[PDB]
Each structure stands twice: as C-alpha cells, then as structure tokens.
Amino acid sequence: GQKVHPYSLRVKINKDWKSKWYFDKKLYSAILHEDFLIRREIMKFLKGIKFDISDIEIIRNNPQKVTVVIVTPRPGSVIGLKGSNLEKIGQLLTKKISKKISIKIKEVKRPELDAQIIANGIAKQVENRASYRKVLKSSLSTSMLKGAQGLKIKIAGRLGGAEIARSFEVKEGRVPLHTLRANIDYGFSEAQTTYGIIGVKVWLFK
RNA sequence: AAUUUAUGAAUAAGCCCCGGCUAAUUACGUGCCAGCAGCCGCGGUAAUACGUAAGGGGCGAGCGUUGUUCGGGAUUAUUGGGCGUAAAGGGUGAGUAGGCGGAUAUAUAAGUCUAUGCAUAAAAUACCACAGCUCAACUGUGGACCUAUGUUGGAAACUAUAUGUCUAGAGUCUGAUAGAGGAAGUUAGAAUUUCUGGUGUAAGGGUGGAAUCUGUUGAUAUCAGAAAGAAUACCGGAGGCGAAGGCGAACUUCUGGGUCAAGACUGACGCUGAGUCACGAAAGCGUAGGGAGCAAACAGGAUUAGAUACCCUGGUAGUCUACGCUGUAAACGAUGCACACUUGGUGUUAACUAAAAGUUAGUACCGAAGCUAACGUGUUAAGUGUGCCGCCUGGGGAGUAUGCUCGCAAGAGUGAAACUCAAAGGAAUUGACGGGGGCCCGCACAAGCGGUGGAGCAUGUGGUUUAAUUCGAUGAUACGCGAGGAACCUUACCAGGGCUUGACAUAUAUAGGAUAUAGUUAGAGAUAAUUAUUCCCCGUUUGGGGUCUAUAUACAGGUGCUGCAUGGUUGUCGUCAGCUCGUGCUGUGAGGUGUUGGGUUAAGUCCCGCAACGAGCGCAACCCUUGUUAUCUGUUACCAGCAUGUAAUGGUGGGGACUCAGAUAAGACUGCCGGUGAUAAGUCGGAGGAAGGUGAGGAUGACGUCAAAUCAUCAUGGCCCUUAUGUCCUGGGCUACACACGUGCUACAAUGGCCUGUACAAAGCGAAGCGAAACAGUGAUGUGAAGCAAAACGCAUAAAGCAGGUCUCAGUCCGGAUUGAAGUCUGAAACUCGACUUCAUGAAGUUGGAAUCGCUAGUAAUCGUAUAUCAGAAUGAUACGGUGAA
Secondary structure, eight states: OOOOOHHHHHBTTTBOOSEEOOOOHHHHHHHHHHHHHHHHHHHHHHHTTTOOOSEEEEEOSSSSEEEEEEEESOHHHHHOSTTHHHHHHHHHHHTTOOSEEEEEEEEOSOGGGOHHHHHHHHHHHHTTTOOHHHHHHHHHHHHHHHTOSEEEEEEEEOGGGOSSOEEEEEEEEOOOTTOSSOOEEEEEEEEEETTEEEEEEEEEEO
C-alpha cells in the first residue's frame, strides 16, 4: 500500500486546505463537523441528479456566517432552474444548522486541466459499459494535447466484468510524484456498475 | 404416359449445430456433483462448451450417429521426403551377383522416338456433342482422349548389343622420399616390491579430521648386493602412419600401404557393392605358464539414522605371454564411399627448389558467399551435381516375447503382437535456481555492550471445558496484533424479558400535538398505564405555510456468508536500485540492443567508448526539525548594571544588554588548495568555517510479487433473515484451566538495599477542567478556593546524582509475588471483574541448557517526566529530557 496521497504531501508547501477558516479549541470540532455535514448533504442532493462536481470548498470568516463555493465545469447545469437548486441547498442546510449560508459557483476554465473532472468523466463512461482501454486512451490523448505537461491514469476492479480483478494504467509526459515543488493535481472517482465497483485515479502534473 | 374441365389454401417439416477448428449469443437452473467431448479441453456460486427456454446458422423428406475406403498425408515422397545434434550412415575393409560408368568410328535396332501407319484392347460403364422420357435421374445414337499388346516401313543422338581406335581416368615399370604400419627374434636403464647383509631408534603410514594396518621378533629412514615382473619419463605437439580398431625405450630380419615426376609402358582394365569372407579397443571364456605394481568380488577401519558406496589399510580373479574362442563400445567427425566444380586469412607436416618464394599431397584454427529449424557448417561442406550401398516412418510396451543361425559359456545377429499415451523429441529465448565462477553490499559475520529462553507477575494466542467463554489476524510480513482503555454501555456471545413501519430515515394522505418537565402504579430495567398540558408558531383568528403524533404504506434494517466478485487502505521483498517506453537497428521467430565495456559512487550516481539515439517512473535535489550569524519585537518572556521585597518568585520600580520566542535572510555548493586518477568522472588529505563531502534525524517507499491483510471503519456485486440473523433493556461473558508458545515488567542483590539533608531538565496538558497557599492525616487522600481558556496560573520541590549514618555475602535490611485486616478515590453500581494506601504475611528466585534478539554515538545501557484513549483504571503504545559508554 505505497504511494502516499500527493495532496497530503503538498499541503502547506504549495497547496492549501479545502476549508478556509480558523477557530480556537472551543468551536473547532463543532464547526469542522458542520463543514463535513455541508459537503455530505450537498453531494447527496446533487448526485441524486448524478452531477459531477470538482470540489466543494468553504470559507468561514464569521462564527455564524458561512460561504460555500461549489466549483464545477458545468456551472449552468449545476445551477439548475434560476438558482432554485441553489436555494434548495440553502434551505435544507439551514434546516439543520443555525448559520447564514451564501452559496457561490466557481466556474472551471479548463475542464481537462482538472484531474477530478477527468476522473469523473472516466467513471461515468465506464458506468455505461464503455470499453475501458479505448476510454482511457482517448482521455489521455485529449488532455495531453490540450497542454498538460504530464498525465497518468489508473483504473482498477472488474474490468469488462471478468471474474478476476485487474488494473490498467496509462501515462505519458512528466509525472514526478516525489518532487515537492511539483504542482501535481490528483483526482479520484468511482463507478458503481452491475458487476461491482471500479476505481479511477488520475495524476496530472503542471 | 400425357391431355381437358369440376371443388378449394383445400391433403402435407422436420433434424443437427451455435468456445476454437467451424457458418451461428444471450438469459435462467446446476456448482469438479449432474454431465459434454472428434481434437485442444469445459463444470469448484455470474458455464456463449452442462440441462432447459429465447434467438441464430446449416441442410431439408430428410437430418444426425456408427462402421468401412480414399482425400487432406509431400505421413513410404517415380511425379514429390530424409539420415551432425529430432526417429535414420553399417565398427572397418577386400570383393561375388547386381546397378552404374572417359573420348571416338562402324554395324545391329532390344530400349527410345515417329507415320498419333495399320490392327487388336466384346458390349455397357468412364469423356465430348446431339437426341427421346413434361425435365432430371434414366435412356439411346455418333464422335473421340488417353495407354496396352502385336505387326509394317523409317530415324539414330542416348541406354543396350558386336567389333575396333585414343589417353586425359585408373594401373605396371623407373627414380626420389617421409612415417609409433605390421609380425618374429634379441637387448637396455630408471623406478617399485621382496629377500639377504651393515648403520641406527620409536614411531611409521593415512585423512576434512581419525582409525584400521605396519613397528621393540629392529619398522620407517639410509648403504651395499641379489632376484622377478610389468610399463617405456625427456623427445612428445593446434605431430606422423594405417581401412578401422590402433600404433612411442633401442637394433636386426621378414613384410603392407601412401606421396611426388613428362618418364616410359598397357589402353577404360573403373566406381559402389545384397549374401559371403577377413580384421576388429577393453571386458570375458578354454588350455598351459607367469604374477612386481595396480585391482572387481571380499575383509577390516571410518563418515552416517543406516553406508552392501564415496575415503583409508589389505586383498583373490583379472591386468602379462603362447594358442584357440567371443565380435561388443559415446567402435564419434554422433557426418558411408567415389568423382567433377565453387573467394580467402593464419599456422603446420612431407616432397620439389641451395634456401627464400611458390606449387603439390596432407593436417589444424578463423572466416566471405551459399546452406541450416537453430546451434553451426563453410575447398578436410553440413555448398552446387550424380553413381551405388546401408538405414528411418510418433512415444511407451521393446530391442522384449517367440522362432531361427552362430557360440563351451556369457551372449551376439535377425526380430513382433496385444495393450496404452497425445504427446515423445531437436535447437534456441526470457526468468528462476546451483553444496558454478567473478565483482560488491547489509549488526550478516567478526570485534564488543545488554537481553530472551530459567523464576514472579502483566499481556496475547493455541489447546481444554462450560449456557456462552463473540470474532478477525497464523512463517519471515499473526501472537502487549485490529484493541489510542472489556466493571454497566462498549459487545458482534449466552441465559432471560419487550418492541415489528420497527431503535432510524425520505416521500406519499389522516387529524390534533411532539415528548415535554417532575413524579406516581407495578417493574430488574426496557417498558405500558399514567398524571401537567397543548396544532404550535409567522396572520388580527378561522383558511392557510410547515410540524410531529397516531395510523396505512413505498420502505427500513443486518458486526449474517463470500477479501478467490471488488473499490479504498495497508504490510512485505525494500529507501533494495532497479523497472519500462518512443523511434532506429538486429533475429524466420520467442527476443535482443539501448540497460552487455573499462572506471566510479550510498545509488541505472557520474565520465568515456560502444546501432544506438532520446525519454519516463525511481536515485539525488526542492520540504520540514536541529546546528552559526544579521535585521526586525521585547509581554505573559529575559535580567546584565541599578535601586529594592526579610522571605521563597524578576518578586517591585525599572532596563533591550543577553538568553529566548518567530518572521524575513545569509551560510556548505568538493566552493577552494595539494596528491592521485585516462586533460576525465572520481578519489585521499589540507585551509577557511558553527556546520565538509548526503552535517544528524524525519518525511518521501519505482514496475510488480505473495488470489498476502481487511465485507468487522466505510463503500460495494451476488447470496441470505424479514415479529427474524433486526432491535430496547436485566444479568452473565469476552477476566473461564492438568497445559504449550510469543511479547514486556520486576528481580535474583555490594557499581547495591535502607535512613537523613541537598542540586540540576525538557516536552506536554487544563473548561466541568487545571485546581494552588494552608490545615487534618504515617499514608492513599480529605476541607477550602487563589489563579487560569493559560510562553500569565495549576499539574510540578523530576529521578538517577551528591553529602553522611547503617547493612556484611547471610535466601540477606536482597527479592515483594501470595494471602489476612483496616482504609483512599471514581461513578447509580466496582462480588465474579478497578486502581491506590496503611499493617502483617515474605514464596519462587544464587545471572538461567539447546537455541535466540537488539545496537556503530548522544547510539546501546539505565533513571524519571508528559500525552493519547479515559468518570475511574497502563509494566502496553506515542513523545520528552538526565547520566552516558565498549
């Protein structure tokens, strides 16, 4: 079980936490857990609609005001109908917490300069019986031509539904995991299928 | 037969197959059972291969199976295969029959060719047209294609027949010449053994190490003499000769073969060769000798569980000679013989030439083209051609059984079948492995310091038994592990009691509060009945917006099975230095090169060269602590020079000096110097410097392996339960024992125990939490509350240490397990099953067998401190400092 999480390696060196706030010992655990609740509720309510979101990141300037930023590459679809889905989030969140939630949508400029988006795309494709090798080759080529300096993709599980599990990997360019000053984006995604569950991991060097 | 009307879709399809061969896939049931199958092979919980359905393919009044023949099989190869290593060259030669064979002239015309003359090859059938059955099959009339024999007339090259000619093939003669060629008869010396005679004494001999054996009856060693047997160092080899086997001291006699040439003669007299004959290493057999040394069988001594062996000491056949048999070898160049041809390089033998220099005939190595499955071969073909002989047709059974021939015998030659397998085999590639080789690394060894295994307890597992002692982890990589806390909860187990839209959700329509706060009734509690009480709030209320009751559902639920259906995470080889790709090149191919060379490093680190050129994941670097300095800031920190509070406290007023804290920077990069090294990479010292060659530590763990661990953290396919395997509570249990193993603690005592006084830390923790000063108490602790969300106060006066007194080698003033009595704290509760204290009780234990673990410097070793889980409870785990080596 090798290969430490690259994000964890790069935190505080050239990355930052996915939640911007600080609080003392008294409030820390409660506010932490309300952040966890926000993510799990948003993602439940959206992956009901199957939506693939790059990240959910939180900014808490105030002990009772909170800013939730959903960052995604299909912002209009994520918004839904005139922000009614936006408020469908907000009302449900206040139905369990006593703070003021302001939701904003961060638009993704380069959909294939985002490892999480790539991983979600792969997972959705293999969820519809698309052939894994062709999907991986196509995605690799597309994102490699768009301008990334290095990309690696690894899927694992019951590929093509055989009895015996297997893992398949593709890569090219520079993917220097051990380099700390590297700007490595890491994404993980996961496909539920009639034959079991298939894991997808994506490394992308910039 | 055929023809014309009358009635009407009326009278009418099945079989095999669907993994590849082989045209045709999905869904259920089965779970290495049932079964399929021509071959390979399918079925162990998701079967396109089994069984049934749905589809699809093939053929069709047929479709499949079995039996038999041919074809695919060039797998009996005339067309059209082989024999170095896959099955296959005879052990070798001389030759009979047979086959084949230089140049050229004439004749014959058997072969061959032609007029596809001429006939004969009955008919049908077989081939090509044309016809008649409604067509076809079927039937009929003509026309031929081969090739088989006979015969007529021609052609003559080739084979054949008969008679000649020639010389270039092959022989004879002449001359020259090399040689362990063979047989017979003589001779020689070294060495060894035995015997005899001197000198001389206690060992000799032998092995990895010993012993048997030899020797005080004179060994071994040494000198002299005598005798016998066998074998021929040096010459002596990338030699020589012979058909092969084989042949090496010297000489003679007898005798076989080869090579060269103008150097004449014969004139095809030749090649190969079934039977047959001759020879044929070593072993063996018969007769008669000989017997030194060596040495099957055999004996003894060792190694070993055993040693009918390897090793040692002895030792009979045999080894030797004469004659007569046997006729077998990895008898090999694993390559039959002969001839005509087909680039070279480097040696060597003989001859011709005075010799070089070349040629010829041999004999070796390398190698172009060609050949070869590859290895390799390559003018001494395994190359291009042919003559003749021998031999092969999957493996086992089997070179067996039986028969025959030969032999004194042992055996040799010839040589099956039944049955059984789907492979056997050749060469080569990539890995792995070696009690193979070479070069390196690691507390791997070595050199050291402490342990484990022995004892007391703590802790885990197995075994064992209970109503249950829930499970998972099981070599390294499980076993003080998941467990960073089993008195209840935890908790998955057990004995009991309740609940069934459920202990909890979301959404569908009812109809008025939820549970609420505090108690009652029974209860072990859960529970139900209850009492206080309501549809509340936004609106000025009804209608409304949502809210739970309490109902009916969609639904929930599961620590139940499968880690061999999985994701995710993790161990491990291993922080070992390796693992691959793009293009190019190379091999028929699996692949190889890059990444095989010489140096060098901790490293596929770096340099050069090399059909490789480059790149990627790794290594290193970038990161975080610690190690020096500079600026910025001095509270809650710090205190130097001041005053000063009697303390204890920088405590107070004061002060930025210092430490310190934390931001920003500098600094160490083989940078520089010397030597060495291929002008290199690198390497050993030196200077500067807090830090030098990665400064020290941590983080960082490549492709992959072990179907390695986990469904029991979560997620998850399939299966399974649905008043149940779910769920609420009471108690028990995970803490059970004749036992075996693993991890730790405390000791066994004098580098120590006990008593008294005194000194020096760091890192952490505190909100229902830290809890001080003091007092009570021998003590665990109790009352109290200062201060503090804390570099502000508290935990907290650290312990080894040091300065004194005591103990005297004693199971002890060592050891503190075990039990008895009385207490402390936690919480509702600690009997099974908590920690701690006081008093008594004082066991095992004398440094621990085989075996085994950790560690290269602030490291082992030892002494305390803090934290995580936590109401309470650590010898475990995490972290911190003190002393500090070999």
